[PDB]
Design a protein around this nucleic acid. Structure first.
Ligand code: CA
Ligand code: CA
Ligand code: CA
Ligand code: CA
Ligand code: CL
Lengths: 17, 309, 309, 315, 19, 18
RNA sequence: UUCUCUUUUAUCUU
């Protein structure tokens, strides 16, 4: 339940395609 | 990945999306083309506030330098009307930045540009007193102008500042966050422009519509009043969408909370200002960071529960 | 080759250069850095027009939202004079978006940015009656301001909107397309900026020069009159050059045609607008499309005949 | 027991030219410049403005020169008693670049007759001392100011009561003190300095009509906030046609008592204008050069690397 | 020569010319 | 001392960080 | 967060 981590996720999710 | 970003680039993305999460302001500038002399300032306001029962209180977070937000309360279940007027709540040291007269705003700095603009509400009420809701949406409020004729002698045509797209505050847009007051909330805003351009500091603005202008001739749905030029005022309008927040308090409900607001702003310091000695060069371009920003921004939800920020 | 473009990036390019080649929805947005919520407006006008003989009719397509073009005729062989006033013709549903009063333009949307601006003229007259020519060039018209003092009490200084570069209409630009009327014509305009900046919606503008303002106080060479605020008006000015068209109808010539107009515009919708329901995130960066756009534009001719379109 | 609420490489020709016109125009036999290798590639006209001014400085005076993004005007000058800075009582008068009128007419409402908009590519300036070594005395000090052209909103008690709005320059207060980031050195050693785009990109600014003075006519300097005044003079000889996105260079020549300070001042400016089809300039038009990423970043990097200014022996 | 075809030619001629 | 060489030195000094 | 299946649109290519 963190904020920074939801940002670090949308960054490594779009950098995978 | 997280390694393609330059220090400034990573830091930038932090001050922009998750500031509470840090012991210190990561922000060190905007990783864009511009590399001139600037001054990074993270404005943080902390304010214990208690809401009026049987009244819906509207808060705007809008890209006005020095001023955290604007509020006004209206009858429960209603929206702002022409009879409504929003009043500012400054960030610490407004005067030390833009003087105390409506014509000494550009004394310290000349122009600016926002990087981040966050806000959070943390309920402090016990489970036997809290009641109500928190609704949130964002409005594309831009600062324009209105031209109209005046029957003076001789007859002339005036022109003054007007807030465009303000009307969007009178309806909760399909895209929104809405949850029980107690759950609090967190939301951030981002650059509503394809690039980070500088905006000039505005001199003499205390009210909108300004003095000697009827609300009717401006089109704006309600009025903006910063009060005594000695305590507050409107120093400029950034390129960030404005965060609208409706907090509904039922009759006989005790809604207390803490309110926080972040703002990573980059100003152009004046050589004479005592600020200047703190400036540095804007961070160099970081393609990756600028792309992550755009993507992350559009990907994030309107707002989230106060529990996670 | 054209597979290096994102879906929207291609769509974008079609609305930009050849929207008559496609049945509908030629664009889904601007594949630039910006990805905030916008609305893709495909403005299209179908106006049957007859040109008065002995008159050199002048038509402007220039980026006034909602209003396709502006025209006025002048004695054959002559150009617009201080004595000339241009009157708008509007894309279907002008009022349905900008209201009916000069101060309700920003009700539905707050800002905008043009992507494309095309126009075509198809001759409908027979080959025995027609005569004349169609000349075309494009002018770098921008919307600025004029500052002058007024002897009122107390004496003051005014400031109003003035159009710079109109002077380019009083002469046939060296870079131009000119050919027989019967051959018709097709031409389009492009962004006259290194990027797609957003422009605010303008309130209260119905005439330029304004009411109570003397022409050439402006230093404008002629006048722009949108008319009744309840039917038309000037809601903004995009960063596109304006297309100038001169159809010279000789004496006893029967010149008629069908005119078509295209305009891809991204507006920033207000949540209180029903219009908002059709919002979608602007297309993400498509560096290829943005580079092709620039190249293609610089490559194409001022204009071409009807059939070539 | 509370139910959740359901939510729903190398540089190109024009690119290298751009870097030369931008940082070193005295070092070339010709105007290297050919346009801005930025995204934009529309019709433009490249103009290389150069002014050569022979000048003597009032002794016991601190003469202040300003290289500002004002098309057609090389610089603005005014002198105050040595040891002091401009006051409300000061007024700067511009020195026009060659052919100001041939470009912007002779009416305060004729500025946009030839061109509609513009954008500065570079703005350099140099001072050369013609004074004999013994006679001269003093110093030259330089710093740059982020002067932007804004607006001021104030009410006016007319009948009926109205609110005014006019142009006002912000960032001038920075001229009333020597910026920490500056170049200071003996007058005789001369000086050379240049300015750069104070924006992340080269957007076009419009041409401004009717401006002759700032504060404008009928406006008290107190209303604008500006620290001093700007007077362009006769609308038929000069004026303010626009304000580019370039930081403004400030130069303070300190001439002590009995000081013979003579020199030459050159002003280099290369600007890209949008020609009006009707204008006689249109015939020299060419399209802005295509984007050149290399140049657009070398520019940014070089700019931040170069010192405030250097002595004239190294221009 | 239609407008879309004059456009697809300049693009593909630009994608191959830059190569 | 030259000015174009001061720029050519900065262009090659940063184009060296690769 | 994971694949199949039909979807069902939508372009690009012959
Ligand atoms: Ca309105
Ligand atoms: Ca004019
Ligand atoms: Ca821009
Ligand atoms: Ca001041
Ligand atoms: Cl507190």
């Amino acid at each position: 339940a963190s904020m920074w981590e939801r940002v670090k996720s949308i960054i490594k999710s779009s950098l995978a395609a | 990945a997280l390694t393609r970003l330059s220090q400034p680039g990573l830091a930038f993305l932090k001050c922009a999306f998750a500031p509470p999460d840090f012991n210190t302001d990561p922000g060190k500038g905007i990783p864009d083309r511009f590399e001139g002399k600037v001054v990074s300032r993270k404005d943080v306001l902390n304010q214990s506030i208690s809401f009026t029962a049987g009244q819906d209180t509207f808060i705007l977070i809008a890209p006005t330098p020095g001023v955290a937000y604007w509020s006004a309360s209206v009858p429960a279940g209603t929206f702002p009307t022409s009879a409504t007027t929003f009043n500012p709540v400054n960030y610490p040291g407004f005067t030390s930045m833009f003087g105390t007269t409506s014509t000494s705003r550009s004394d310290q700095v000349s122009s600016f540009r926002y990087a981040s603009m966050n806000v959070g509400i943390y309920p402090t009420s016990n489970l036997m007193q809290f009641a109500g809701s928190i609704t949130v949406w964002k409005c594309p409020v831009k600062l324009s102008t209105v031209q109209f004729p005046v029957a003076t002698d001789p007859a002339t045509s005036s022109l003054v500042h007007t807030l465009v797209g303000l009307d969007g505050v009178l309806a909760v847009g399909p895209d929104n966050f809405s949850e029980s007051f107690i759950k609090g909330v967190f939301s951030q805003s981002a650059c509503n422009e394809p690039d980070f351009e500088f905006n000039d500091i505005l001199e003499g603005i205390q009210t909108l519509p300004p003095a000697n202008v009827s609300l009717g001739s401006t089109g704006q749905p309600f009025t903006m009043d910063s009060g005594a030029e000695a305590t507050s005022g409107v120093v400029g309008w950034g390129n960030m969408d404005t965060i609208v927040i409706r907090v509904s308090a039922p009759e006989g409900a005790v809604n207390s909370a803490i309110l926080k607001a972040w703002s990573c702003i980059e100003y152009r310091p004046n050589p004479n200002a005592m600020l200047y000695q703190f400036g540095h060069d804007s961070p160099p371009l970081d393609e990756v960071a600028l792309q992550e920003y755009r993507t992350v921004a559009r990907s994030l939800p309107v707002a989230v529960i106060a529990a996670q920020n």
